Amino acid sequence: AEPGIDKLFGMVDSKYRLTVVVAKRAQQLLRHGFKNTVLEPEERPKMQTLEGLFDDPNAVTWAMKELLTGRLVFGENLVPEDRLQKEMERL
Amino acid sequence: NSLKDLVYQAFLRLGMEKTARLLDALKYYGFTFSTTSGITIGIDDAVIPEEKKQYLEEADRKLLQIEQAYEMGFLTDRERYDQILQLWTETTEKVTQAVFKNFEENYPFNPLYVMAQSGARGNPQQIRQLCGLRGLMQKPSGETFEVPVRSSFREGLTVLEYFISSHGARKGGADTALRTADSGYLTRKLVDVTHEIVVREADCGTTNYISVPLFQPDEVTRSLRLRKRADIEAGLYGRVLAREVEVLGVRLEEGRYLSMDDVHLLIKAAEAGEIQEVPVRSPLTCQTRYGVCQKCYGYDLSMARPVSIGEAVGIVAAQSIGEPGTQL
Amino acid sequence: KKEVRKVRIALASPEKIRSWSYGEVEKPETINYRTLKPERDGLFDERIFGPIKDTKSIVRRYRMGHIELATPAAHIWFVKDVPSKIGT
Amino acid sequence: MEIKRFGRIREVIPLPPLTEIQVESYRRALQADVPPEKRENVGIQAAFRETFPIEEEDKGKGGLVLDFLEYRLGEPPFPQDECREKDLTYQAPLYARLQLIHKDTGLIKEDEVFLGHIPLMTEDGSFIINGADRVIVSQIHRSPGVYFTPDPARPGRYIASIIPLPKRGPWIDLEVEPNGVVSMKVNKRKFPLVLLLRVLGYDQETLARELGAYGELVQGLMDESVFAMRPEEALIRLFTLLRPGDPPKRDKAVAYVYGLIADPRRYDLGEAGRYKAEEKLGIRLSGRTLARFEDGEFKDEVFLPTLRYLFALTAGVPGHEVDDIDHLGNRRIRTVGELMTDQFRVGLARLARGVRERMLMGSEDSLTPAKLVNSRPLEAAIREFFSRSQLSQFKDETNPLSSLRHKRRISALGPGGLTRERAGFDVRDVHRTHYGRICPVETPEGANIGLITSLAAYARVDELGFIRTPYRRVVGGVVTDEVVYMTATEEDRYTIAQANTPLEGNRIAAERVVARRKGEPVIVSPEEVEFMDVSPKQVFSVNTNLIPFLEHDDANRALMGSNMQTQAVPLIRAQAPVVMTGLEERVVRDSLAALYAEEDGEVAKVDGNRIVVRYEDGRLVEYPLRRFYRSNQGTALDQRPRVVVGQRVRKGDLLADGPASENGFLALGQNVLVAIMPFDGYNFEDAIVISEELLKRDFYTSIHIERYEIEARDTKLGPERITRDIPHLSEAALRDLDEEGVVRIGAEVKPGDILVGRTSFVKDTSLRVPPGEGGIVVRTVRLRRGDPGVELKPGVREVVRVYVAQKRKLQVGDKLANRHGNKGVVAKILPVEDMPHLPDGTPVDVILNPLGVPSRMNLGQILETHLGLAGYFLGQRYISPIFDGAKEPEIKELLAQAFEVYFGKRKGEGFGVDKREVEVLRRAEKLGLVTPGKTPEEQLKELFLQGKVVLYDGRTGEPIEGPIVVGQMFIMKLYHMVEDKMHARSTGPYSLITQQPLGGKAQFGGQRFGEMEVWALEAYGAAHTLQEMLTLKSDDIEGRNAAYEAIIKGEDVPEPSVPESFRVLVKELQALALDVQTLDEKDNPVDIFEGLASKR
Amino acid sequence: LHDKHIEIVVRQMMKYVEVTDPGDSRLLEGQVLEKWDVEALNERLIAEGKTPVAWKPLLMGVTKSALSTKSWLSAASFQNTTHVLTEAAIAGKKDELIGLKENVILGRLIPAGTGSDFVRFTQVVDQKTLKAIEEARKEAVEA
Amino acid sequence: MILEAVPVLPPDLRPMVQVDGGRFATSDLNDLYRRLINRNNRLKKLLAQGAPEIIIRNEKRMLQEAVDALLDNGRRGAPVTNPGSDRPLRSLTDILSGKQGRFRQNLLGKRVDYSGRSVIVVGPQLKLHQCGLPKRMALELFKPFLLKKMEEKGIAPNVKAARRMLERQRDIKDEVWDALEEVIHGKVVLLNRAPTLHRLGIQAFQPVLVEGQSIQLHPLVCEAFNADFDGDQMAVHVPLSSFAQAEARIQMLSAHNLLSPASGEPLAKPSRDIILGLYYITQV
RNA sequence: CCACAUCCACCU
Ligand SMILES: [Mg+2]
Ligand SMILES: [Zn+2]
């Protein structure tokens, strides 16, 4: 499978919410680019033939490994949505 | 069955990744040891027990007796047909028992017997047809032929016996080719009628439930006995207790999902004779607008944990009901 | 821009039918064999359904016509349904 | 290499010509060979003499008498070779001699008038219609005659049915209603039969002493005595009861249309309807049907016997005299001849109506040749029957066995008014009368189960759709060589023994003999036996008879093995099975695929393409060979020479091999060393593990020919020219396109390479190799407007067809199977080094999973494996009948001899028993396989008797624990079309109405997602996957375009929009008086279209 | 086979009642039990006027239950387009997009699974962006 | 409720297409519309010229029948095409209703872009979360992703060059295979069996590039699908969006679906051969 | 261009 699906299910009330969180994190990682990650310093995905898993081979694994750590928060309404949603599309 | 229980226990007590790794290891080692063990099927592996021989003779003698019993006018056509059918269906079971006893006693490592004991392939009826006899054959009219098939596939079937078995072959082919369509139509009906059910919920204040019985109300004219373990498991496993119940010194709190261990404990307690009905929540009493709530739905899923909110339980329910219909 | 929330189905008035269509067809001439272009004001007229040459041809996928009958007629659905709606 | 046969049965008669049904039917239909003066009249001449001779008494210019004298046909316009090369019809023009007579003077006789071209049967038994060849399959239906059926509701009485043909005609139904009503419903309205009986000239007194003498139900008809006292005006009231509105003074309008010819069936005299009449009831049925018209009055020969017989059965009991609907003696076969004759007489009736109309319009008389008969209706009817009919279907030339089976198939279906797909459950089951006439195993699985079947090997339709089974006459205790072909009704009266009963030559050797009283297995004495089965082979079809050990197989796997024997491709070097049944030589001989010497002689010249043979009479004949002929299904048909220059040959001796014959023996497959053991995982459930030895030597290899075709046609922009030069770009790739427009022969072509260069109005529209595979160009044919004898589709100036051949080899995609229904797909091709091998250096070729044996019931393959193991060392072949094969002691003795030879060869070099063999033997001793206390010599011998030998792993070198069963199996590669090829596309053609993508020839086309897959997808929590797969990847054109551009740009796909299918649905709703619009959260309409719906 | 699925189907089988004592509608008409419950709660408690809508549960087959539904899209696409479309055309049937079949027809997001409003939107921000916006929040809370 | 003006469907919804040699294939909608237009024009002309009452009434009945036949065919009589082809014309209701109608072709999404199908073979060396995909069909299915990946590096200057490079297989290179392997490192594909009886008929897998024509399938899922290896084929689909990729990899991956939804019985249980081997090793 | 009809097969 993928690293720690059991604790990923444990830290969320429903699997569908986990899917929404991981996919939204992946979309952010794409459209921002991979700069705003919380796993930059040492713990990063390791590619086989080179270190190609530095930049962008597959972002779902990035989002999952990023959510495995405790630097992420998710909720129904945690931040004023209007400002960030208007800054999401107009930049 | 041991492997299935092992897999279920590993999934319950370990999780997802560990169960998958265990399955991979089991598959790899099973392949390697099946290869090195050398299981082969020859014509001599379909051993014909000698005792069954005289069994036929005995039946034949009894057959002759029934024959003369008909020529004296003591029996009617229906009575004679019933007697012949009962005699042959009894000697068939006797031959099957003798075949399996011979396999147990003389050749424990016989490929046919080894495959039959394990869940690999085959059934006792198929093993009997290979080594014993495929006696009773159904007529196209729906009844059964009076004359059975004495020979087996280890021996050579007579032309008439093969022509008779072609009846059953054609019946099976046509029955599959039409019952598949009927089952598909039923599945479509159920999916369309049930497609609107989705678990969207805050826990509904339902002070209602259903009492699942634990005893068969009528197996004889007037008697009570405990239901089969499979039926009780299919009725109780993964449900939510309506109200707190203490049956064997253990307090099963209200609102607790019934795991497999709880079902086993309840079955043991019912065997001891403490309770007869289990009050549990059910979708039938749920008050949700369009669907059922998490509590009233239950606990059984692809995983073990309680159902996630937002799952389309209606379509999976319809698929679960309709899938076995094609193999019925 | 607004999201779809409900789908309403109802009867269409003759005014609605005339509002839908852009002109009326009168000739039962689909397309001439020699001239691959549309023949006349019939079922494939150029000016009644839009340009056939690359607005794109997609307008012809959505523009509708209409026929003004000199005699009124009733929908077969409302007269031949098992409960005859006009009949009830 | 010797051939050893096991069965002890004297086949008194050999197999009849396996394709004689269609050939004899067509030869009886068309009597071209015999002079027209001959007495033979049934067939096309029957139709001519029945319908054509129109007579006109008084209608304007009366006295019209157009009579038929003779018909002839003797010359096909072209031989069949270019009738296949060019899309013509191998037909013959039909000429008829007509003559016209009027009431005045005049003999206007035209000896020759052309009326349509009728197709001619080829030598094998097929027809060529438009280039390709088709077969017309026989039909089974209710035989015409008089039947009796129990009432669906009333249990005391029943109904009688006299059934003529066609449907637009009589269908007489007699019912006895308890109020004393003899109801007779002819077409749609019931009728008291008493009035018709009175019309027939029968009074009450003869009805009393001829019908009511024995039965008390005559009061059910004699009660109506108030109205039975009229000779002739009863006919007038009978016509008045009808509702045509016509005046009652029409004596022979409808009362006589049920007379001689028009309405009543003209079923063939004696057997078609008379045998169903004369045998069932009465004594004889004089004439064709019930009528007299020489005195105005009417006569009967059916109504009175039918009433007498019905009253006898309903009151008394002459016998259990109720006809079964599915009894094969009451069912009749319309062969190709009968169907062709029916369609021909339909066309003749159309021509008769046309000529009657022309005569009515025409004024003068000297107009017999042209102004009367026109060939258009009859020719159109014949062409429609031979092209668009349901029973005239594409020939299956995968192999000679496939063609033969397709030629001898019987279908319950047909035009549509007889039997139909959706509901046929009652008639799908086999019947007790199918024994010896219809194969109970040959039916194809699927929707067409039970409806379509094949007749038995010894089965034979005699003259009128009545299958007859051969039976040996038994007188007392001696079995006579006399053989009689019997029908089901004839068979139901005697006791028939079995072929397996012990015999002392010409004497029954058993006391208790198994027999069939009436389809019922009983045991009797030899003195009560009248008939004997000729052979077990008469119970199964030709295809089913090829399975050696059928007696040890399940019916279902035997069915599918027989079915898959049809679809086995011919191999480059195919060899006959080690274990045979004995019909292979008969199959290859009767199927006209090989060459045989017609007379004793000596071969003169032998080449790769023709053989010149000089016979004993001094006449030399040249036999050409279809060297590489593409079949209907794309396989290769080859005749390989099998004789040497200056070699003496006998009559009927083999000259050249067929497409799938080794030496006069049906060889479609290979003989390979098979080990029945489970390998690692590569034979898991039904998969198959094969050696690389089978690939290092070309052992499973077939030539496949694909025929591409492209035409240049005259367009309004200008004619398209097949020219070498390409307009815009391709000149580097033009090297392969050697000549003008056509690619050179022998040039390999890959996908995307030009085959034919065509230029449209200039624009490049050239035929290229489609994505997938391409091989070697072998042939190219060009047809132009300069027609020697060819005809083309109007508007098309020319056409070119290119045949590309490739040499397919066995790989993972392919599937293999044996004659016992053990299907399998090659899963891995192992190298030679790591496969299991014998104690000798020889390794096994194929490894089969044993778990497929006990789950199903196919033990015949195990016996075949043991016998092949014996024959591999003995170097000989075995022929064993299906139900008289080799007994287990015989196979054991053969295995003992084989082990003697094998281990003697082993000891010849001075070797004993390996230590690995020692440990294997001790382990088997612990398993009870071998008796203890014996030396490894006889222990290994006893193990060999079981058919199991010690194998070595090869990967590890250590022996496989426990003995392994190995032998020789006949494994054949099944038909392999594009099914394995990956129809994987990413972007292709889209449909017009909806934008859902579907391609085909250009691109593979999208995979179905249906609703069950949708239900499964939304059973999960997947919502965005379904959203994109219904709109982004399926229909939303702007969405799919934007997604494609974004993916190219390496960005996330955009949000999907409303699919075009919903827009189509909305517009179709708006086409009706309906009104559908999408609404916002409030009651504000939202336009799904951008602005296109809004006007301007 | 477990009993949850059969119970779901049986509940959907008899989700219909027909009233005996009329309230604000006709008597011998059958429709959703839950709608009648809402009407009774509105009539007795929420609004003034004690008019008991005395109903009885009606058990109808799977086909009849599937055909007679509030949403006309599923009924039209299921068994018989003609009758369902005629009935939905007599009275303007504003099909609320509840149920998976209608959303499949329109191609929009499925209400079940990921599309459920319970989990449809879930804002996700990493630690540093959350800290920045929360610093903005607490500096908006002056002093 | 009765209609005075009859709507007319857009032309592309009832197109006339050249087939070969100038012949036109047309939907029955065009024929019905032509008949209605001709009959209405005849009625207008007849009403304009004169009023023979019986002829006018007959023409009114005829026009009403034509309108009814256009709206729905078969409810009264059976109007047919030109004589010689007795196939009833297809009306609006036939387009809508039926087992093959507009509702039963848009509810289903009968066609998909990024999809393929092939015969399946056993995959014993594969892990449970993996499937074997032939490299040619894998390259074809992931074509736009491959184009983008090789545009990232120096294989091709622009996407047109990459497409013309990949259009002919004689230009295949090891760098292209390496790029294709890099593309599908984290992607998953949906495998499907033709009869989708239950939820497990669709399963996500991690593709592994293999040499051959068949799809390698893990033996343990031989029971989740009703798929043996006697020649049956399975289909493969490729989700595109990262949202759908996460969905498939989380809640449709075969590694996460080990137990039935109908009951608690597992479906990833050891199969026939594994059971046989484990029984043989653990027997006394 | 692929529409529809008919037929034969393959996997359940
Ligand atoms: Mg299969
Ligand atoms: Zn609830």
Residue numbers in the entry:
A (entry chain K): 2 to 92
B (entry chain J): 909 to 1236
C (entry chain J): 2 to 55, 81 to 114
D (entry chain I): 1 to 761, 785 to 1119
E (entry chain J): 1363 to 1505
F (entry chain J): 512 to 795
Sentences from the paper on this structure:
For many bacterial genes, transcription termination is mediated by the adenosine triphosphate–dependent RNA translocase/helicase Rho, which causes RNA/DNA dissociation from the RNAP elongation complex (EC). Rho is an adenosine triphosphate (ATP)–dependent RNA translocase/helicase with 5′ → 3′ directionality. Rho forms a ring-shaped homo-hexameric complex, mediated by the CTD.
For the cryo-EM analysis of the EC-Rho complex, the EC was prepared using the same DNA/RNA as in the RNA release assay. A 125-nucleotide RNA was elongated by adding ATP, cytidine triphosphate (CTP), and uridine triphosphate (UTP), and the EC was stalled at the first G stretch on the DNA. The EC holds a transcription bubble containing a 10-bp DNA/RNA hybrid within the RNAP main channel.
